[PDB]
Structure formats: structure tokens, C-alpha cells
Nucleic acid binder design. Structure first.
Lengths: 49, 141, 37, 91, 54, 122
RNA sequence: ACUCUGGUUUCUCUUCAGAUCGCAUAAAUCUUUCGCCUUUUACUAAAGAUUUCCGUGGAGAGGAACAACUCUGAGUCUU
RNA sequence: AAGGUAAGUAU
């Protein structure tokens, strides 16, 4: 395979490794949902399109 | 900061700009607690007495006096503005904003030079004065 | 498509805060050494 | 009570009503209108993730639309069964 | 007065969305402030005894 | 040349503009060792294939070692079943290729809608 | 071979999240080390700590579909 | 994205 696709392979691996390394467990939260508080107010309507 | 005279409402700023007829009114819009404003105000206090003959320095709290926030775009942490005979004076600082000085200057000589240039140009009738120093770069090396 | 969606999830807060503080009624806007003295 | 699903013609009529700024019929409803425009990126993010796949002609999605036509979100998360999704993309 | 009652709706919506971790991040910053002040006390407290002696 | 590459490696061990492309100098898959250059690709028992790459081409790039092993170890009886399966699959693929052929091999009257739009799109 | 055993789905709210919340993966700020350096606003790329965002699990609560029978184990379970 | 606003009288 040519040089550019190989370098693409190493760079994709680099980004994958960086993501897997600089990963911290998600922080606890109270689960506030958007698009649920929009329709609570009298400003948004629901349909299907 | 706490030594320079303070203007407490928009009418007081109006009168301060109107009152002086032979001196440039230097007004610092900002907050006393802002670190950039503290540096600017301590430089102004350092040069407050030296420029007594041709400049008067006032301090305006934009939170307390938001009267000129819309027109003068007083939204930077610190702002220094010059007026002469009830006429805002612009300075070709090289920063792209000629209407005001919106950063803290360390050297007290540069502010004296800016005030002196503003006074000369305004007494000559100009509305724009080219600053002796070009501030397009902080000259950090 | 998924790569640009992953960019989108990160860039959404920036655009949201830049807008909401722009088309609102009220607009909002060397200090280390000259600090302690 | 609970908010039901409005007919799809409601949003079409509202959007056709909201033509341009030149029309003088709507000039005072500004805070209600442009207060929700800051959520435009979500509208960008919600539809792009709900993009129809190559094996679908029409993809009906639930829509949460502003009462003034200012904004419309695709109120749906593209949940898929992973072996089914992978097999579909292999096909 | 249909505008001042509509800004409050969006403001409360923004506050509700911030309510996800508002208590869990304003509590951690409290402990960080206490830890920082343990080593570097406030300037006013560094003169509290002298100010008292005036 | 490559003999001096090993010695050079031993000595080295012991002694504005937007770039959409990735520079070829960033490539790491450069080796002097013949073992690490011409690696032995996984045969997967002659019955597994790398993803993405089409199976038809992968079959003809196979090492043929496992095919020879099968045709050697297989007895006649079990060889007939594999021959029948190969013939059936070959006939199915031949029918698929016959149906999926270019418009140059079809008459105008027997053209289908897909072939018609393929010809039009040319 | 018996009587009682009470569902599942779905819409919201309030909290706790250890765990690949996530078999996927962005952005911002700050602090250091750098590479551009020429000034912010953007950056080069590693580290550390944070924030936001796209999503998630568990539990509790409140409505709806549900309409409830019974699943089901508990048992003297029977010839 | 910028650091590229001549200023001045007159309606």
C-alpha cells in the first residue's frame, strides 16, 4: 500500500491511542434533560415531520 | 485607584468633560477591583500630579455608571478615554481601536507621552492624534 | 459523519454561549507581577 | 393534562407566516422569538445525527418546534441495534 | 409586558440546565479555596492582629 | 545498503500554511530488518479474509499453501462434495455476473431500467 | 397436583453514580513544558487539574397506556 | 477574524 494510506493508518492509531489514554470517567450529574424542559414551557410544540 | 477622583453618575461625567476648557480630561472606565484596572489606575496615580497642568484624571465605575456602555463600547475590563473641550479624541495606537486605550500600560512615561500628544493635537484642533509608540506589538523579545 | 458530530458536540457550548450573550438585551464583556504590591 | 402531537401542517403554516422582517404583522414578539435562537447549534446537532441512512427513502422524526417558528429540534436520539446496524452497513 | 415574562423563562431554563453539577462543582471549589487558604492566608487576615492593636 | 542499515541503527541506539495532507516523513513503518519488512500475513487457515477488501480478489492473492494441503489430504469421496459445492457456487456467481454485465453486452430491446439509466448517465 | 401471588410498556420529576456511566469520543479554561513567535483572537503537542457539552446506569417519586388476568415463587402440591 | 477608521468645518 502507498505511503499516504500508511501514514493515515498511523495517524488514526495515534488519535485512537490519545483518546483511550486521556480518558477520564464521566462526572456524576443530576440528569437535567434538554428538549424535556422546552416542552414544559408554553413555547414549544411537538409533532412528527 | 482609591486616590484619584471618582465620578458617581452620568451627569457627573458629563460635567467633568464639559468643565475643563484648557486641559484634556482622562477618564478610566472600569472597576476598582479589576486587576487590569488596578494597574492602569496605579499608573494614572503615579502620573496624576505630573500632568496637573495639562490633564485631569477621573475614574468612573461602569457598573455604577453604565450610562456610556452602549455608545462608548465600554465592555473591555479596562478603558482609558481622552476628551478635550467636550470632544472625544482618537489615538492612532496601531491596535485597530483608535477610540480608546483598552489595556493596562506598565511604564508611566508612555502614558505621559500619550496625554501630551493628545493635548498637543487637540489644542491644534485635531480629532485624531498619532501616538509616539505603535502598540500593534508588545515588543516582547 | 460521526467525526463531524463529535466535533459538533464539543463546539455547541461555544456557539450557544457566544450567541446567547450576543442577541440578549444586556451585553457582557501582565497582572501577575503587578498584583501583590 | 398533557401536550399532544400537533398536526404537521401547523409548523408549515407557522413558518410560512414567518416570512421576513419586512412584514409588519410581527414586530413586537422579539424576546420570545430570538431568546431561543441561542440553541441553534443543537438544531444543527440533532438533525445531523438523525440523518437518514442509505437504505431509507423517508425518515419521519419527532420534531420539537418553537411556537413562533424560530427553531426546530429533531427530538430523537438515533438508537440502533449494533449487529443490525453493522450488518446494514455491510450490505 | 409580554417580554419581561419571557426572558425569565429562558433564564430559568438556563439555570435548570446548569443545575446538573452546580452543587457538585460549587462544593469542590469550596474545598479548593479552603486548601489554598490553609497555606496562603488572605492578606487582610495577615494584618488582623496589628489592625486589632490600632 | 541494508547491511549498513543495521550497523547505523546500532550506532544510533548506542552512540500561515494549512497542511491537509500528512507528510510522508511522518511514516513510522520503515524497517531495515527483512523479518519486519516482509511480514508473514495471517492466512487464517485459508478460510478467513481481511475486512473491507473484496473476497474475490483476496482468493486469488492467497498463498495456495492451504489449497494444496486440502487437495492433497482430501480423499476422493470428500473431494467430490467440495467439487460439487465449488461448481454450484461458480454457476451462481456466473449467473450473477451475466445479470450484472455492462450494456455493451446487451441488446437495446432487452435493456432493463437500471441498464437504461446506466447508459444514459454515461 | 392445588390457592394466593398484581404485571409490562411509556411519559415526566428528584437524586446518586463507583462502573469501558460511553466496547464511543468533542470542546473550553487554567497551570506547567515546548514548536511558531509578531499583537490579541485563533494555534504547534505533550502533561496536570478543572468546566461545559453529546449521551448512560441505579434508585425513589408522580401521571398514562392496563386491562388483569395471571406469570412466578412461597405451600403440604393431590391421587 | 483582526492588528488597514485621516481629521476638520457646513447643512
Amino acid at each position: 500500500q502507498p505511503v499516504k494510506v500508511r501514514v493515515s493508518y498511523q495517524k488514526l492509531l495515534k488519535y485512537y491511542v490519545l483518546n483511550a489514554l486521556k480518558h477520564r470517567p464521566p462526572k456524576a450529574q443530576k440528569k437535567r434533560y434538554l428538549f424535556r424542559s422546552f416542552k414544559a414551557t408554553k413555547f414549544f410544540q411537538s409533532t412528527k415531520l | 485607584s482609591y486616590m484619584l477622583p471618582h465620578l458617581h453618575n452620568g451627569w457627573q461625567v458629563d460635567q467633568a468633560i464639559l468643565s475643563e476648557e484648557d486641559r484634556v480630561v482622562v477618564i478610566r472606565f472600569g472597576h476598582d477591583w479589576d486587576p487590569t484596572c488596578m494597574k492602569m489606575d496605579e499608573v494614572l496615580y503615579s502620573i496624576a500630579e505630573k500632568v496637573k497642568n495639562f490633564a485631569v484624571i477621573y475614574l468612573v465605575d461602569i457598573t455604577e455608571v453604565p450610562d456610556f456602555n452602549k455608545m462608548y463600547e465600554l465592555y473591555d475590563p479596562c478603558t482609558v478615554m481622552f476628551f478635550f473641550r467636550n470632544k472625544h479624541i482618537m489615538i492612532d495606537l496601531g491596535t485597530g481601536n483608535n477610540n480608546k486605550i483598552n489595556w493596562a500600560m506598565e511604564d508611566k512615561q508612555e502614558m505621559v507621552d500619550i496625554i501630551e500628544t493628545v493635548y498637543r493635537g487637540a489644542r491644534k484642533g485635531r480629532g485624531l492624534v498619532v501616538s509616539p509608540k505603535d502598540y500593534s506589538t508588545k515588543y516582547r523579545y | 459523519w460521526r467525526v463531524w458530530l463529535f466535533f459538533m458536540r464539543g463546539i455547541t457550548p461555544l456557539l450557544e454561549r457566544w450567541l446567547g450573550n450576543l442577541l440578549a438585551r444586556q451585553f457582557e464583556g501582565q497582572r501577575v507581577e503587578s498584583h501583590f504590591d | 393534562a398533557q401536550k399532544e402531537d400537533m398536526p404537521p401542517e401547523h409548523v408549515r403554516k407557522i413558518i410560512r407566516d414567518h416570512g421576513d422582517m419586512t412584514n409588519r404583522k410581527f414586530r413586537h414578539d422579539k424576546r420570545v422569538y430570538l431568546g431561543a435562537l441561542k440553541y441553534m447549534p443543537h438544531a444543527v446537532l440533532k438533525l445531523l445525527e438523525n440523518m437518514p441512512m442509505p437504505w431509507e427513502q423517508i425518515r419521519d422524526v419527532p420534531v420539537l418546534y418553537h411556537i413562533t417558528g424560530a427553531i426546530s429540534f429533531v427530538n430523537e436520539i438515533p438508537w440502533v441495534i449494533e449487529p443490525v446496524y453493522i450488518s446494514q452497513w455491510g450490505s | 409586558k409580554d417580554d419581561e415574562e419571557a426572558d425569565a423563562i429562558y433564564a430559568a431554563l438556563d439555570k435548570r440546565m446548569d443545575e446538573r453539577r452546580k452543587e457538585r462543582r460549587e462544593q469542590r471549589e469550596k474545598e479548593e479555596i479552603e486548601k489554598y487558604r490553609m497555606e496562603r492566608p488572605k492578606i487582610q487576615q495577615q494584618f488582623s492582629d496589628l489592625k486589632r492593636k490600632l | 545498503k541494508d547491511k549498513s542499515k543495521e550497523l547505523h541503527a546500532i550506532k544510533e541506539r548506542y552512540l500561515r500554511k494549512f497542511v491537509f495532507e500528512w507528510d510522508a516523513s511522518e511514516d513510522t513503518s520503515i524497517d531495515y530488518n527483512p523479518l519486519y519488512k516482509e511480514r508473514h500475513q495471517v492466512q487464517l487457515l485459508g478460510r478467513g479474509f481481511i475486512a473491507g477488501i473484496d473476497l474475490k480478489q483476496q482468493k486469488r492473492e492467497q498463498s495456495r499453501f492451504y489449497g494444496d494441503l486440502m487437495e492433497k489430504r482430501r480423499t476422493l469421496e470428500e473431494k467430490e462434495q467440495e467439487e460439487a459445492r465449488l461448481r454450484k457456487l461458480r454457476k451462481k456467481e456466473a449467473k450473477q455476473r451475466w445479470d450484472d454485465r455492462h450494456w455493451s453486452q446487451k441488446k437495446l430491446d432487452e435493456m432493463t431500467d437500471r441498464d437504461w439509466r446506466i447508459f444514459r448517465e454515461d
